[PDB]
Amino acid sequence: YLDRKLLTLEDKELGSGNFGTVKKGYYQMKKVVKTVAVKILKNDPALKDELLAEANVMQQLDNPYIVRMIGICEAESWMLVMEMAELGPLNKYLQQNRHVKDKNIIELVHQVSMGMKYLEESNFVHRDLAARNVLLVTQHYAKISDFGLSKALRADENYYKAGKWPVKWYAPECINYYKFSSKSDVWSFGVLMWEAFSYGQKPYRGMKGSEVTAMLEKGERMGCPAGCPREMYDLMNLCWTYDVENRPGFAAVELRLRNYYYD
Ligand SMILES: O=S1(=O)NCc2ccc(Nc3nccc(N(CCO)c4cccc5[nH]ncc45)n3)cc21
């Protein structure tokens, strides 16, 4: 829990969602002043639980490619205070910056894969991995964010059995059997890659969720984005392996990206 006196907020608003608004601020750590992003709950038991589940999860996470939580501050409102990733969501950035080179995109997605390999080792599932939920520190440093749908897996289980339903990022076992695992997160990571190489274009455009599900069961997949290296498109296809058993884990995904990047 944070000291409201040690927090200064801008008057400007960075963004707003169902939960409320987001403001940029500063929090005085012992000596240094650290720039922060803050979710400020508008005015709702669900939203408080949402903020609470995300905080509960972040508190246990510690990795260079995952957004770091500073803490919670109870004052004029409930506040979730994170270290600021200044450049914001990966999709919106690439949408405004098409000069980004393929090798730069590969670097950022490898970084995500490294954060997810950590998440997988830590036995947490993200359940909302998408380009909108990756934040940029700099043009060469990505962090995974938005852990509101995330779950710590029980010590005796490999998956979580299941609100917000981003079906275009969901593996078939999620849609058909409500089972969410690190391998489901791998499926989503494939969609994320596609997004990144499509410079933030939405996947499966013009299609309803049921239509995407039909497409995938037919064995059809999204095509290679313009200028996307083939090796990276091949990795998207591996991530979209239908049968979860045979879908690769994040260790193999991260390895594959590393070798392509450093070679
Ligand atoms: O999308 S935006 O609001 N509009 C422009 C912009 C520019 C920079 C950021 N950066 C940022 N860094 C860290 C955390 C964070 N947020 C707010 C966005 O969800 C968080 C605060 C509290 C908890 C959180 N979990 N995941 C992100 C996040 N934002 C964000 C934005």
CATH class in words for 85-263: mainly alpha
| CA 217 remoteness from chain centre | 25
Tell me whether residue 205 is exposed, middle or buried, using C-beta atoms within 10 angstroms of its C-beta: 0 to 12, 13 to 18, 19 or more: exposed
Three-class DSSP category at 131: helix
Catalytic residue numbers?
128
SS3 36: strand
Rg of the chain over Cα atoms, rounded to whole angstroms, equals 18
Chain centroid offset of residue 85 CA? 13
- Ligand 1 mean position, distance from CA 212 (Å): 29
Nearest CA to ligand 1 atom 19: 146
* Homologous superfamily of 1-84: Phosphorylase Kinase; domain 1 (3.30.200.20)
Kindly state the tokens that stand for 194.
């596609």
The two tokens of residue 41 are: 């709950």
Query: What does the domain layout of the chain look like in residue ranges?
Result: 1-84, 85-263
Separation between Cα atoms, residue 67 and residue 61, nearest integer Å: 9
Taking Cα atoms as reference points, which of 1, 64, 71 lies closest to residue 39?
A: 71
Which residues are known binding-site members for ATP? 14-22, 39
> Which tokens sit at 116?
């997810």
Query: Resolution to 1 decimal, in Å?
Result: 1.8
Residue of 2, 59, 67, 134 to test ligand 1 pocket, by largest number of atoms within 8 Å of CB: 67
Per the annotation, binding residues are 14-22, 39
